[PDB]
Short mmCIF file of all heavy atoms in Angstrom, two decimals:
data_model
loop_
_atom_site.label_atom_id
_atom_site.label_comp_id
_atom_site.label_asym_id
_atom_site.label_seq_id
_atom_site.Cartn_x
_atom_site.Cartn_y
_atom_site.Cartn_z
N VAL A 127 55.49 15.18 15.45
CA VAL A 127 54.98 16.02 16.55
C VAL A 127 54.00 17.08 16.05
O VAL A 127 54.39 17.91 15.25
CB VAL A 127 56.12 16.74 17.29
CG1 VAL A 127 55.50 17.58 18.44
CG2 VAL A 127 57.16 15.78 17.90
N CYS A 128 52.77 17.08 16.55
CA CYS A 128 51.83 18.14 16.20
C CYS A 128 52.26 19.48 16.84
O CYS A 128 52.37 19.59 18.07
CB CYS A 128 50.46 17.80 16.68
SG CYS A 128 49.22 19.08 16.25
N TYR A 129 52.44 20.47 16.00
CA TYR A 129 52.81 21.83 16.48
C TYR A 129 51.81 22.31 17.52
O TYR A 129 52.19 23.03 18.49
CB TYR A 129 52.83 22.76 15.30
CG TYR A 129 53.08 24.15 15.68
CD1 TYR A 129 54.23 24.46 16.40
CD2 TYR A 129 52.17 25.17 15.42
CE1 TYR A 129 54.50 25.74 16.83
CE2 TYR A 129 52.45 26.49 15.86
CZ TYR A 129 53.62 26.73 16.56
OH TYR A 129 53.99 27.99 17.03
N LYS A 130 50.54 22.08 17.27
CA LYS A 130 49.47 22.68 18.12
C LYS A 130 49.23 21.96 19.40
O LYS A 130 49.29 22.56 20.47
CB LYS A 130 48.17 22.82 17.33
CG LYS A 130 48.26 23.70 16.09
CD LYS A 130 47.06 24.64 15.87
CE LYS A 130 45.71 24.19 16.45
NZ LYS A 130 44.70 25.32 16.56
N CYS A 131 48.98 20.66 19.36
CA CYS A 131 48.64 19.93 20.58
C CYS A 131 49.83 19.24 21.23
O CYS A 131 49.75 18.75 22.34
CB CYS A 131 47.47 18.99 20.36
SG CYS A 131 47.90 17.52 19.41
N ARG A 132 50.93 19.21 20.52
CA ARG A 132 52.23 18.65 20.98
C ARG A 132 52.22 17.09 21.05
O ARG A 132 53.21 16.52 21.53
CB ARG A 132 52.67 19.23 22.33
CG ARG A 132 52.55 20.74 22.48
CD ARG A 132 53.22 21.50 21.41
NE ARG A 132 54.66 21.34 21.45
CZ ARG A 132 55.48 21.74 20.48
NH1 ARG A 132 55.01 22.34 19.39
NH2 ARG A 132 56.79 21.54 20.59
N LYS A 133 51.17 16.47 20.57
CA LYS A 133 51.05 14.99 20.59
C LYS A 133 51.72 14.40 19.36
O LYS A 133 51.68 14.94 18.30
CB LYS A 133 49.60 14.49 20.61
CG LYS A 133 48.88 14.37 19.24
CD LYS A 133 47.38 13.96 19.34
CE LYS A 133 46.68 13.79 17.98
NZ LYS A 133 45.17 13.78 17.94
N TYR A 135 51.60 12.13 16.24
CA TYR A 135 50.56 11.68 15.38
C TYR A 135 51.13 10.83 14.20
O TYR A 135 52.27 11.01 13.74
CB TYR A 135 49.65 12.83 14.89
CG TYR A 135 50.30 13.74 13.89
CD1 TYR A 135 50.14 13.55 12.52
CD2 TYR A 135 51.03 14.81 14.29
CE1 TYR A 135 50.76 14.40 11.59
CE2 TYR A 135 51.67 15.66 13.36
CZ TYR A 135 51.45 15.50 12.03
OH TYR A 135 52.14 16.32 11.18
N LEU A 149 53.57 20.75 10.75
CA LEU A 149 53.22 19.42 11.19
C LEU A 149 52.06 19.54 12.16
O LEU A 149 52.23 19.97 13.30
CB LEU A 149 54.45 18.74 11.79
CG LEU A 149 55.68 18.51 10.95
CD1 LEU A 149 56.76 17.94 11.84
CD2 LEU A 149 55.33 17.57 9.81
N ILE A 150 50.87 19.20 11.71
CA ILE A 150 49.64 19.35 12.47
C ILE A 150 48.85 18.08 12.30
O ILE A 150 48.57 17.65 11.14
CB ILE A 150 48.80 20.56 11.93
CG1 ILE A 150 49.67 21.82 11.81
CG2 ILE A 150 47.57 20.81 12.82
CD1 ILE A 150 50.03 22.38 13.10
N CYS A 151 48.36 17.54 13.39
CA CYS A 151 47.59 16.31 13.40
C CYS A 151 46.17 16.56 12.84
O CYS A 151 45.75 17.72 12.68
CB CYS A 151 47.51 15.74 14.79
SG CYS A 151 46.34 16.52 15.92
N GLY A 152 45.44 15.47 12.56
CA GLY A 152 44.12 15.60 11.99
C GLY A 152 43.19 16.32 12.93
O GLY A 152 42.42 17.19 12.48
N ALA A 153 43.29 16.07 14.25
CA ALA A 153 42.37 16.74 15.21
C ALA A 153 42.56 18.23 15.21
O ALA A 153 41.59 18.97 15.39
CB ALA A 153 42.51 16.18 16.64
N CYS A 154 43.79 18.67 14.97
CA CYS A 154 44.17 20.07 15.00
C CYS A 154 44.07 20.77 13.67
O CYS A 154 44.30 22.00 13.60
CB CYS A 154 45.58 20.26 15.59
SG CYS A 154 45.68 19.80 17.33
N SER A 155 43.71 20.04 12.60
CA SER A 155 43.60 20.54 11.27
C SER A 155 42.27 20.00 10.66
O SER A 155 42.24 19.62 9.51
CB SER A 155 44.78 20.15 10.46
OG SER A 155 45.00 18.74 10.35
ZN1 ZN B 3 47.34 18.20 17.25
#
Side-chain angles (χ1 to χ4, degrees):
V127 181
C128 181
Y129 175 57
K130 300 222 333 163
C131 74
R132 315 306 294 168
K133 84 184 182 197
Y135 72 94
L149 299 175
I150 310 289
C151 78
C154 294
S155 59

